[PDB]
Amino acid sequence: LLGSLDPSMTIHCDMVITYGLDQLENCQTCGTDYIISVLNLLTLIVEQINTKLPSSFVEKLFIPSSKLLFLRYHKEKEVVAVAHAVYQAVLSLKNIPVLETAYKLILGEMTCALNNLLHSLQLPEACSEIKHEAFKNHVFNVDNAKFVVIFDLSALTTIGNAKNWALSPTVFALLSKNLMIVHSDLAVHFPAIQYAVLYTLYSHCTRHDHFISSSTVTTATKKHFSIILNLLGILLKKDNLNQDTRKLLMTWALEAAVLMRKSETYAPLFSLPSFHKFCKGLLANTLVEDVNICLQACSSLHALSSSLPDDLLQRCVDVCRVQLVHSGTRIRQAFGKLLKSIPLDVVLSNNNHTEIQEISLALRSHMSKAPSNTFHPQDFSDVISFILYGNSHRTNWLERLFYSCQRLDKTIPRNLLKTDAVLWQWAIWE
Amino acid sequence: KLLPPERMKHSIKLVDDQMNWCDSAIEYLLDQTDVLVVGVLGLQGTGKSMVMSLLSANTPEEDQRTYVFRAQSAEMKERGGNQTSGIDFFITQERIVFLDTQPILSPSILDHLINNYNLPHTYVEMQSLQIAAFLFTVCHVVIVVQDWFTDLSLYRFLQTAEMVKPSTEYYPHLVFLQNKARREDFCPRKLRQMHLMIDQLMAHSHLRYKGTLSMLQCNVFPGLPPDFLDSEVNLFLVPFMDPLFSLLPGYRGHPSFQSLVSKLRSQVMSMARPQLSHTILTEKNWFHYAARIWDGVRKSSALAEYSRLL
Amino acid sequence: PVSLRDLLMGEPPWREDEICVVGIFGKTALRLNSEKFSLVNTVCDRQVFPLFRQDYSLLQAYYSQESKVLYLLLTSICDNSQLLRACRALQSGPHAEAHEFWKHQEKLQCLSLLYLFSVCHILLLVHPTCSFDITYDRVFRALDGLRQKVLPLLKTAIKDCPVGKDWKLNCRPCPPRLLFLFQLNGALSPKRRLQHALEDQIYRIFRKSRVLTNQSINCLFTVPANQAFVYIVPGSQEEDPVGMLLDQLRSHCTFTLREFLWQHVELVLSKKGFDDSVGRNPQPSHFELPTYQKWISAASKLYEVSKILSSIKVLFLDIDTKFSENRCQKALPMAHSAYVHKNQLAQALRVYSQHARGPAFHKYAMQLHEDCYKFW
Numbered sequence A: 001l002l003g004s005l006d007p008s009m010t011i012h013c014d015m016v017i018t019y020g021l022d023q024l025e026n027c028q029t030c031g032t033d034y035i036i037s038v039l040n041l042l043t044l045i046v047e048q049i050n051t052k053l054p055s056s057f058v059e060k061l062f063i064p065s066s067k068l069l070f071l072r073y074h075k076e077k078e079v080v081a082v083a084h085a086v087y088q089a090v091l092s093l094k095n096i097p098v099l100e101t102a103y104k105l106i107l108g109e110m111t112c113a114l115n116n117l118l119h120s121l122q123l124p125e126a127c128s129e130i131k132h133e134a135f136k137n138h139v140f141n142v143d144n145a146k147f148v149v150i151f152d153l154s155a156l157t158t159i160g161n162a163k164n165w166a167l168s169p170t171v172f173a174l175l176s177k178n179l180m181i182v183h184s185d186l187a188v189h190f191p192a193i194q195y196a197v198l199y200t201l202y203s204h205c206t207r208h209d210h211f212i213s214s215s216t217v218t219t220a221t222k223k224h225f226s227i228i229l230n231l232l233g234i235l236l237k238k239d240n241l242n243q244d245t246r247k248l249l250m251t252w253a254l255e256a257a258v259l260m261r262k263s264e265t266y267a268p269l270f271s272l273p274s275f276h277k278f279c280k281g282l283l284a285n286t287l288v289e290d291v292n293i294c295l296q297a298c299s300s301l302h303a304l305s306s307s308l309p310d311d312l313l314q315r316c317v318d319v320c321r322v323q324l325v326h327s328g329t330r331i332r333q334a335f336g337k338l339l340k341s342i343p344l345d346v347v348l349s350n351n352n353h354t355e356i357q358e359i360s361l362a363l364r365s366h367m368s369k370a371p372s373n374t375f376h377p378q379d380f381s382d383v384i385s386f387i388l389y390g391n392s393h394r395t396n397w398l399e400r401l402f403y404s405c406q407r408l409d410k411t412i413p414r415n416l417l418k419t420d421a422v423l424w425q426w427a428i429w430e
Numbered sequence B: 001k002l003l004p005p006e007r008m009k010h011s012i013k014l015v016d017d018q019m020n021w022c023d024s025a026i027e028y029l030l031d032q033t034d035v036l037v038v039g040v041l042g043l044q045g046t047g048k049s050m051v052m053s054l055l056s057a058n059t060p061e062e063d064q065r066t067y068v069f070r071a072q073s074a075e076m077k078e079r080g081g082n083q084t085s086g087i088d089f090f091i092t093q094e095r096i097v098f099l100d101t102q103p104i105l106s107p108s109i110l111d112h113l114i115n116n117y118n119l120p121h122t123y124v125e126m127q128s129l130q131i132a133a134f135l136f137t138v139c140h141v142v143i144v145v146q147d148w149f150t151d152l153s154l155y156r157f158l159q160t161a162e163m164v165k166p167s168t169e170y171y172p173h174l175v176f177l178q179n180k181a182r183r184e185d186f187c188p189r190k191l192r193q194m195h196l197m198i199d200q201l202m203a204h205s206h207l208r209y210k211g212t213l214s215m216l217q218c219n220v221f222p223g224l225p226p227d228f229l230d231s232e233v234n235l236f237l238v239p240f241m242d243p244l245f246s247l248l249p250g251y252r253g254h255p256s257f258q259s260l261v262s263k264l265r266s267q268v269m270s271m272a273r274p275q276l277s278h279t280i281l282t283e284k285n286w287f288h289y290a291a292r293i294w295d296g297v298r299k300s301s302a303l304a305e306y307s308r309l310l
Numbered sequence C: 001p002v003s004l005r006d007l008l009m010g011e012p013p014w015r016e017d018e019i020c021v022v023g024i025f026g027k028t029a030l031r032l033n034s035e036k037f038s039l040v041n042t043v044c045d046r047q048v049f050p051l052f053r054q055d056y057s058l059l060q061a062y063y064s065q066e067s068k069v070l071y072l073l074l075t076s077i078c079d080n081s082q083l084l085r086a087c088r089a090l091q092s093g094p095h096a097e098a099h100e101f102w103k104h105q106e107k108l109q110c111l112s113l114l115y116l117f118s119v120c121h122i123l124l125l126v127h128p129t130c131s132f133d134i135t136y137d138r139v140f141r142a143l144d145g146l147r148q149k150v151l152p153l154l155k156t157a158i159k160d161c162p163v164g165k166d167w168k169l170n171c172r173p174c175p176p177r178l179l180f181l182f183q184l185n186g187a188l189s190p191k192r193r194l195q196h197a198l199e200d201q202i203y204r205i206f207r208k209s210r211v212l213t214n215q216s217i218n219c220l221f222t223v224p225a226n227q228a229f230v231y232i233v234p235g236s237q238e239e240d241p242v243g244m245l246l247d248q249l250r251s252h253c254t255f256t257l258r259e260f261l262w263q264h265v266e267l268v269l270s271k272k273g274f275d276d277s278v279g280r281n282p283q284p285s286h287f288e289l290p291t292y293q294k295w296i297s298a299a300s301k302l303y304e305v306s307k308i309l310s311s312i313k314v315l316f317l318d319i320d321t322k323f324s325e326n327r328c329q330k331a332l333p334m335a336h337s338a339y340v341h342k343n344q345l346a347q348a349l350r351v352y353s354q355h356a357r358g359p360a361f362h363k364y365a366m367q368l369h370e371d372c373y374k375f376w
């Protein structure tokens, strides 16, 4: 009946509001259908009454005593879906004063959950700049806190993915500067929160072309690309990242790199320091055990081969030289093309190669060690047969042989075990 | 004049399904020393055959129809039956011996034996105990594969088997492999509980279930410090089979299956090989020793003592 | 959702209503959402158990007025929730103390299971994998005999009860029906074939072990002869709420268990009862449909229960303990016939240790050492 009309009148809202609140206040241990019906009615009521809902309506709807917060814990996916719909409808209002309180309440709940997790992890609290009085003293379990944080982050997509909302804590700043503690220690015990934050930030930035044209709305976003590049560089330079997080970061980096050179008007963006940090992170993230990550890094570097200083090109030459001899096939071709894309003025330079130095150091350290006496006669026979006659009689066999020649009861880096040069030298010495 | 003897294409049967010795592996053995023996144990659908195949001479990208160790087929799962029978044998080019094993206390064998002791129920238990003892006395390492966490009945069985073994005592290393792991099982909070339960449930096992094969140092957990665990036992997890923003894949929360399989294979191959008897043994000598041990275990005395108690 | 002990002590709205007792038990893996709680929530269609919420045994009771059914959930060392707590407590606070501790826990769990096997109408066993452990066959074999030694004592405490006549004789309302529930666990219509194969295997294994007999009176439980008694829960995204939330975020950025249970509940609720006997000569089976107060009158008396501890101590780690004791005793005579005295004592101890060992070798070693020392 309410949906039959249109939101262009002044019908009595006090009766409808009190009816909905009364039904919601006594809908805890109800059936699977009654809860869905009540939530649907609330969503329809909120959508029907636009810009006319009093602040008290949403003030008592996002508090710990409110039953709505306890209805999202249902196992059925339909209940969670309708709850998210309710959150979306409430956050999709055009009245700033009635939306500010809801946004502050959501931020306060997220801060409370984060503080609870930090306390349970034996660490001091943080994010005191977005705390709320409604959540001054409360207890959230580890699983409950994680679920609440993820739910709030997912609900924030209503305003984060908007198509053009002038609030004090901007979504970009909230996910890029306010929630900076999730990458310090929470990323090790709770990587889901970090992945969700990065995913929502990426989804919000990809809809605005990573804020390239800007680098009212244009003036406010005049320093977004620099922050994005700095964040990407700092995150990539780390060594305590997860596989999913690293893959997402690499995809974001590749997309940004491909976009940097789509036009020729972005040339001045190659002199700012964030770009240098980003390139450093990309160069330091390669030469890892993962093959797909290395391929993505190589493709990204090959994309914007030009516009880089002599230092970056020099490092790329050494990386390509060490990667030219790999047990795989795609890596060799990718690095070969990247090397071929470098001018002769840098490949033929007399600069020192760091990767070659590390390889030599590892070989020297292994040789200086005491003999192991683990090389079996069969291995020696196979090596001799392959050198003097060319037939190895073995169907990546070097890595398998090296692993079989080690002992755990009684130290070459793992990243260097995929190179055939190191394996060949080790086999010859053995 | 130094070519290898031969290359094995498929695993052979070391012991018939009727608990009978099959001396047919000497054709692929040499006179070399310092051999490594790996055995497996587990329930019916844990996936011991697949793990052994992927760790000996197979790759995940290959097909299940050409594995060295026969795996369960789709038509067999619907019937609730077993595939591996008896004990298998296979040796890779690195002179590493791999031994398979049929499921212990599986209902398939029981049902097959129904239509064929006091009752036909303790026979399966004794066969399982015999296999466990044999693997514990003639193998360098034993890997236990569990479909789910904390069965609570495998620990008692392992202790009972080691207590009734044939025979300055030698105790092979024990590895706890958790197959079909999920995202919830790849968290430090759950890892601590797993290690604590494993350590408290095997305090007097006398086996080497700690100090070796530490997945924490295998780069599985980047920012997890070693002191975060009171006692890191040898436990490994194996997961289930596995413009630009819209192409992002789903979030699994665990490393790739191939990466973990490769890491497990490398760690297993880089393990120690302690002496078994009070003398040096070669491949042929090891085979003869294993045959003698099996013969002695069959006609043993402790087994009869345990049999009259049931 | 209150404890069983806290419920019998305390009704007027449902003082006399025909109800059915359903017991839930089995093993459970280490997970945030237990299988039993989810099962109860799905059957009752309501959030009965809210999410994120000396001895190691517990019995929970819950009544459903919309369906007039009582549920009795059992938790013991088998479940990982209690096992984790037990291990944590044992970590802070000898090869002989741990054995006794585990034996006591097993005995307590067995006693609780026996109690549930006599005051329930329909009971179901859960499992985390499709395959069923054959060890259960032995557990039941070790439980039936136990009730045979406790039945005379149970009927003596419920003599002054309004349960009826058959209840006072068999110490049970009617032969309980056991149901089996498994989980896909990523395995694999194929489901129907797998269920039929599992039912056939279970029936054959139970019949061979003499657990199930033709008469539906002597046996402690029976299974349907023409209906289905095995259910397999398929995989779903309900578990691990984090994964479901992540999937929802990604999407935004871009028969049945109930019927399976009512099929059997409708029989007891209609007073028809159960009839499972194909031994070429079936006989009538006792059955009763008590009310709330009528059922509590007997449940409280059975729960309050001198000689139970003595009878339960005669019944598993008992085999292992006996084997270890026998091995130690046999090894002791060999070392006692082998014996300044330090070398002889060390040699005797080494010979005894190499001869045999078990879970109680400390006592034998101490006795041998004392005997050797006193012999000089």
Ligand SMILES: Nc1ncnc2c1ncn2[C@@H]1O[C@H](COP(=O)(O)OP(=O)(O)OP(=O)(O)O)[C@@H](O)[C@H]1O
Residues within 6 Å of the ligand: B042, B043, B044, B045, B046, B047, B048, B049, B050, B051, B064, B070, B071, B072, B073, B081, B082, B083, B084, B085, B102, B103, B179, B180, B238, B239, B240, B241
């Ligand atoms: N990690 C895994 N992820 C997905 N599927 C798996 C996994 N491990 C095993 N499987 C599958 O589940 C089944 C397990 O049986 P498999 O052949 O691996 O050995 P098994 O269970 O030890 O056999 P047996 O019954 O002889 O003891 C097979 O169909 C296999 O393909």
Ligand SMILES: [Mg+2]
Residues within 6 Å of the ligand: B048, B049, B050, B070, B071, B072, B083, B084
């Ligand atoms: Mg198999």
